[PDB]
mmCIF file of C-alpha atoms in Angstrom:
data_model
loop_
_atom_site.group_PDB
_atom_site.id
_atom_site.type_symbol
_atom_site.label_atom_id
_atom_site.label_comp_id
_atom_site.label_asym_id
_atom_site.label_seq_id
_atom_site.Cartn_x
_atom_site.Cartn_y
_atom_site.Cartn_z
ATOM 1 C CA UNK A 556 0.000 0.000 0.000
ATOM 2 C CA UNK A 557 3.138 2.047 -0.035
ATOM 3 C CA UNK A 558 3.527 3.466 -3.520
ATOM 4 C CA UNK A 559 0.442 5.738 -3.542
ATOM 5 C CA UNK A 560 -0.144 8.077 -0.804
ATOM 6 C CA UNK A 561 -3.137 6.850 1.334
ATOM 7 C CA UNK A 562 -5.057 9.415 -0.077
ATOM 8 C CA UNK A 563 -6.078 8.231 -3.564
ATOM 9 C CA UNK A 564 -6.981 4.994 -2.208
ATOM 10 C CA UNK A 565 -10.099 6.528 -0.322
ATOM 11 C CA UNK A 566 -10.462 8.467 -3.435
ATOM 12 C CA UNK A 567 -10.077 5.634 -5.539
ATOM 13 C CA UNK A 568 -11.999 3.064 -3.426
ATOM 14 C CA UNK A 569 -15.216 5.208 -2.996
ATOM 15 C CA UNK A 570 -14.725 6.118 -7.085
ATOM 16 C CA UNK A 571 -15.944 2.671 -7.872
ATOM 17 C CA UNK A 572 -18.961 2.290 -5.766
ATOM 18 C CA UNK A 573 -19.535 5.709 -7.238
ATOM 19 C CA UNK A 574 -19.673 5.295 -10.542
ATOM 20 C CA UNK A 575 -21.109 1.727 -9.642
ATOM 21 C CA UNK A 576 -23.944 3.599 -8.837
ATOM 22 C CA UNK A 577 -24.171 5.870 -11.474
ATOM 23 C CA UNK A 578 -24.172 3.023 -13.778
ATOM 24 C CA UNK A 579 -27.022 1.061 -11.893
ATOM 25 C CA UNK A 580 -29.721 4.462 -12.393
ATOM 26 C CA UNK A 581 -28.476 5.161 -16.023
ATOM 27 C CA UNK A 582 -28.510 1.431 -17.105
ATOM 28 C CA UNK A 583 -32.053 0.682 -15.809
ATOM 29 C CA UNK A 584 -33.301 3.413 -17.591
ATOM 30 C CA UNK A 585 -32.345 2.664 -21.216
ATOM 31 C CA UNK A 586 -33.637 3.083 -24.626
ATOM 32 C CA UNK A 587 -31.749 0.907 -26.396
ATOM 33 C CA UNK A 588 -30.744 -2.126 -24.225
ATOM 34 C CA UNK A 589 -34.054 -3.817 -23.165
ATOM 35 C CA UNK A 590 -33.818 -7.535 -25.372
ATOM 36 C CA UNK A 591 -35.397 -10.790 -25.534
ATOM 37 C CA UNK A 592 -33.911 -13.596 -23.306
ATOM 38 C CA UNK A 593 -34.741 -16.544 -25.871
ATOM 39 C CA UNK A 594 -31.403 -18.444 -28.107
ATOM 40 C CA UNK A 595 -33.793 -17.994 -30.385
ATOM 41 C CA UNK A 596 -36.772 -15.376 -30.285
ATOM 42 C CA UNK A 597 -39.983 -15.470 -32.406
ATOM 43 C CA UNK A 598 -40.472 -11.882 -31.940
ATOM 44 C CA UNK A 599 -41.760 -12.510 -28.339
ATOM 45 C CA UNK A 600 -42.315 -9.711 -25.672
ATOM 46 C CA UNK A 601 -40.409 -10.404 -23.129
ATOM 47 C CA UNK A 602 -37.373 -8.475 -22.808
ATOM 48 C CA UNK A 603 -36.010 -6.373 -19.829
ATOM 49 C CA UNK A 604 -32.652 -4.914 -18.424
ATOM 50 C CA UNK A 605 -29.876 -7.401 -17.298
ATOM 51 C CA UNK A 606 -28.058 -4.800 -14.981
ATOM 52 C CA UNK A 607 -28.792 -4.949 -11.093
ATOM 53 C CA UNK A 608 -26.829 -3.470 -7.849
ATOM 54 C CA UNK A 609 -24.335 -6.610 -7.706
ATOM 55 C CA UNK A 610 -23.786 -7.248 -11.606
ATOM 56 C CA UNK A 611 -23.044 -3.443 -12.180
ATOM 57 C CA UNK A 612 -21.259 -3.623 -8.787
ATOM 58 C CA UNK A 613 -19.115 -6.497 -9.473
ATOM 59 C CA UNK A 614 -17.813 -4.896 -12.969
ATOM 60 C CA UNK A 615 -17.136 -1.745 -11.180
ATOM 61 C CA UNK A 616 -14.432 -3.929 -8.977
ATOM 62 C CA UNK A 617 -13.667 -6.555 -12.426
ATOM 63 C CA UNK A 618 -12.933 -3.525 -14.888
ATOM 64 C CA UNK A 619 -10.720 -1.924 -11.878
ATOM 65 C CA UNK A 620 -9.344 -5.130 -10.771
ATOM 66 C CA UNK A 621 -8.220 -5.769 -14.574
ATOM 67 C CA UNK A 622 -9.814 -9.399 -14.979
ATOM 68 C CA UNK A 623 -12.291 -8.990 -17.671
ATOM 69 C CA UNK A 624 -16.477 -9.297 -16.734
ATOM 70 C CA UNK A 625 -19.596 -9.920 -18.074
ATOM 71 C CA UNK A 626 -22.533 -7.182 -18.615
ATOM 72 C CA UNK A 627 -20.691 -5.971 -21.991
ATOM 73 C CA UNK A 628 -22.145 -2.496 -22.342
ATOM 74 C CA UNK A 629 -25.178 -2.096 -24.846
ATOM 75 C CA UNK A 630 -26.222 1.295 -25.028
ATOM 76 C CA UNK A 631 -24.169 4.647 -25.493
ATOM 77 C CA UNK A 632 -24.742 5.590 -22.054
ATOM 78 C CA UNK A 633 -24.012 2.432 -20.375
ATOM 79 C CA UNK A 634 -20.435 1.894 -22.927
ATOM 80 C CA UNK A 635 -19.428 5.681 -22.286
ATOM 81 C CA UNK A 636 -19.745 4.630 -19.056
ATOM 82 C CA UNK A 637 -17.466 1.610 -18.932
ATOM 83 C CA UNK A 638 -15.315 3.027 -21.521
ATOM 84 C CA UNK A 639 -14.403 6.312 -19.287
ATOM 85 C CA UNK A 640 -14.356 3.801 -16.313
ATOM 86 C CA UNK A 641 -11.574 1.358 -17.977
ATOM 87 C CA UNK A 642 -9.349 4.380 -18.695
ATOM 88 C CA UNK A 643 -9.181 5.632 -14.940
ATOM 89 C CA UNK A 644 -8.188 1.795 -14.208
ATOM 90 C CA UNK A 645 -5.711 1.714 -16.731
ATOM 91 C CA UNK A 646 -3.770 4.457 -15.780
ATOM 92 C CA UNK A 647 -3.629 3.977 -11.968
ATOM 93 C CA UNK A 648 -2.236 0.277 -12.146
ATOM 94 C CA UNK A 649 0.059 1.762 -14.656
ATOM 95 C CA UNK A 650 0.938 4.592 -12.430
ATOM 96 C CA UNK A 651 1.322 1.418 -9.809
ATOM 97 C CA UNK A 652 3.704 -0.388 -11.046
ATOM 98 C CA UNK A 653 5.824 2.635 -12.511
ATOM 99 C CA UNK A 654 6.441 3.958 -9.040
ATOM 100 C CA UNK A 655 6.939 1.133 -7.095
ATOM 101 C CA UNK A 656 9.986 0.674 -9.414
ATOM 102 C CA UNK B 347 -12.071 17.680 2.095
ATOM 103 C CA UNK B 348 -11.426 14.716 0.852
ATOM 104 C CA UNK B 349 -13.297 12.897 3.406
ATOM 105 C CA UNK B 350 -16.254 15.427 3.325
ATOM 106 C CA UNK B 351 -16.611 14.859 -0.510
ATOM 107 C CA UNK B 352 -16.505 11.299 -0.373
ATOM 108 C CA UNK B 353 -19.149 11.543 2.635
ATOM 109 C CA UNK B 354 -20.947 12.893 -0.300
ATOM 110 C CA UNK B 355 -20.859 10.242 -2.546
ATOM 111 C CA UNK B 356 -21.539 8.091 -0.220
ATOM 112 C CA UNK B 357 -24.775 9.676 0.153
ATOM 113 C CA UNK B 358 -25.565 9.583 -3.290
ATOM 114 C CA UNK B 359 -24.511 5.452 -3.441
ATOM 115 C CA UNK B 360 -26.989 5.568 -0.346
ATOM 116 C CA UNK B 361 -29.625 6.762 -1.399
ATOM 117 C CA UNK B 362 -29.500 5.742 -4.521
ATOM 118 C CA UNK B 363 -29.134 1.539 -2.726
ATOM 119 C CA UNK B 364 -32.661 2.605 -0.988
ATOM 120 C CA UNK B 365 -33.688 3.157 -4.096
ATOM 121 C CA UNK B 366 -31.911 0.372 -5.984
ATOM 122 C CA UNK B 367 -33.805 -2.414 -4.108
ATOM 123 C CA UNK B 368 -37.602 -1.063 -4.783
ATOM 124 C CA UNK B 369 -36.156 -1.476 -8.432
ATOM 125 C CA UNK B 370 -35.027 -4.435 -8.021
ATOM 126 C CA UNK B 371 -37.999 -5.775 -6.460
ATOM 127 C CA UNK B 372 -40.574 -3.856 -9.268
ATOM 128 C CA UNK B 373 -39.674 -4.880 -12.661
ATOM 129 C CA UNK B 374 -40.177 -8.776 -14.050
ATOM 130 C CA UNK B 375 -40.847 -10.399 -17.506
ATOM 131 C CA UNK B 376 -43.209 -9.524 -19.819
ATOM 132 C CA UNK C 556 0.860 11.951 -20.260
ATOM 133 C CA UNK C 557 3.697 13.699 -19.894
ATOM 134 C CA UNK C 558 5.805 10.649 -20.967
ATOM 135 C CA UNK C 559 4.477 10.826 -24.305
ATOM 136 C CA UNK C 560 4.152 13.653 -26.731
ATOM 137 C CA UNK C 561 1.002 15.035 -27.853
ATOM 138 C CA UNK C 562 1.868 14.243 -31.286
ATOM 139 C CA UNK C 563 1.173 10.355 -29.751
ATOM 140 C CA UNK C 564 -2.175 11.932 -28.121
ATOM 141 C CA UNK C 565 -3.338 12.626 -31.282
ATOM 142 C CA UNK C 566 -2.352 9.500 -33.654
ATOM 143 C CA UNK C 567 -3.845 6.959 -31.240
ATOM 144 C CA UNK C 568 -7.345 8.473 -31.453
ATOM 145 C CA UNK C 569 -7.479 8.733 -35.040
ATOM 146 C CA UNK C 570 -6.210 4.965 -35.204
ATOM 147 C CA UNK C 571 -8.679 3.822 -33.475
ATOM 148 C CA UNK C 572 -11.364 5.398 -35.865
ATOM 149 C CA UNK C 573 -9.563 4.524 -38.858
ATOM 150 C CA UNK C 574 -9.206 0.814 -37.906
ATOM 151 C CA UNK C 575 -12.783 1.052 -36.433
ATOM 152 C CA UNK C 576 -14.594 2.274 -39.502
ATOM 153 C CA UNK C 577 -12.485 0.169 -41.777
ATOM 154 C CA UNK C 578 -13.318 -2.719 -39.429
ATOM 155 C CA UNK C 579 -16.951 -1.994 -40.303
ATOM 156 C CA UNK C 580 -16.552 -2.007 -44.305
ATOM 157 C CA UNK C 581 -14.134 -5.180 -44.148
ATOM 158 C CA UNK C 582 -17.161 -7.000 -41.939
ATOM 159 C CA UNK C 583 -19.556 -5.879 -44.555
ATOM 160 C CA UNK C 584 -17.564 -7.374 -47.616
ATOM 161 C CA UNK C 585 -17.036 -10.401 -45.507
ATOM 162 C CA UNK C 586 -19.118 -13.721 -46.859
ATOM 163 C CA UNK C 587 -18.521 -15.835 -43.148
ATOM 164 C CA UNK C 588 -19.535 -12.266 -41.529
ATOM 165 C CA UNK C 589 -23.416 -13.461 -41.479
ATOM 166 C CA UNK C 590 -24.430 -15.091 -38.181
ATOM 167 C CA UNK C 591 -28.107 -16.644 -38.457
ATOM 168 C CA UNK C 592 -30.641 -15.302 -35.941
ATOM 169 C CA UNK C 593 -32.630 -18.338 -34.355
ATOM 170 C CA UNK C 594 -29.634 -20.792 -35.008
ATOM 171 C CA UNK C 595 -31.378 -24.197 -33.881
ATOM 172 C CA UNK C 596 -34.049 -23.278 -37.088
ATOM 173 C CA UNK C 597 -32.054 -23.422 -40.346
ATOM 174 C CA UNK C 598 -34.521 -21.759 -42.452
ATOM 175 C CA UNK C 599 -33.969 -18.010 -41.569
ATOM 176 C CA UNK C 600 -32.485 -14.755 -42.862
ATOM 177 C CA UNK C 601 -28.699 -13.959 -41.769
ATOM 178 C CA UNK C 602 -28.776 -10.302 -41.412
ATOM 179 C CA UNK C 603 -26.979 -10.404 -37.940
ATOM 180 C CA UNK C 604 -23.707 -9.700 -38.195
ATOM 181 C CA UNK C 605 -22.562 -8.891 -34.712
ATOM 182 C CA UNK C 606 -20.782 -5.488 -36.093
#
């Protein structure tokens, strides 16, 4: 826990629940993303959302924790949203490992 | 205010988590 | 990114556009690029293309 000041790290840790929750409102309200569960769908009615508190919660630690996870983003909201996300998480393990050198 | 700020987001991920469950518990198939 | 110049800042983006878009044509013009909705029935249209 050296390397970064103890600072960023209560940044950083309440950053993911925070844009964990973020995600959760946007994603359940969605124009695009609502599909149809069935392999193989004869134009049935039964779609809905497949984002919850735990699956968007559990990406927001994956995509940080750099071990890839489900729930790949449908919409435009919901992918600006992990895409944004993923850079923040690249940069900090990269700014992890190049000061602990 | 580091910790002040992030006492702010934690109440948005609170209130937001009383709100998450009445969505979780509204919406099904149809 | 101040180990990198801007110069770098720049390129990437437009790389990933480029290689994006052409991405898109190169799927279109592609003859194995036509997955078929409802795969258990074989008698369907192939329109999805994942891209």
């Amino acid at each position: 826990l050296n390397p970064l000041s103890p600072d960023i790290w209560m940044y950083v840790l309440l950053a993911c629940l925070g844009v964990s929750c973020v995600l959760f409102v946007i994603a359940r309200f969605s124009p695009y993303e609502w599909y149809n569960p069935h392999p193989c769908n004869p134009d049935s009615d039964v779609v809905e959302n497949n984002f919850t508190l735990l699956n968007s919660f559990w990406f927001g630690v994956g995509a940080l924790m750099q071990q890839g996870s489900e729930l790949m983003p449908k919409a435009l909201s919901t992918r600006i949203v992990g895409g944004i996300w993923w850079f923040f998480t690249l940069i900090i393990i990269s700014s992890y490992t190049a000061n602990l050198a | 205010h580091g910790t002040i700020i992030g006492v702010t987001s934690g109440i948005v991920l609170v209130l937001l988590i009383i709100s998450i469950l009445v969505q979780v518990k509204q919406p099904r198939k149809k």
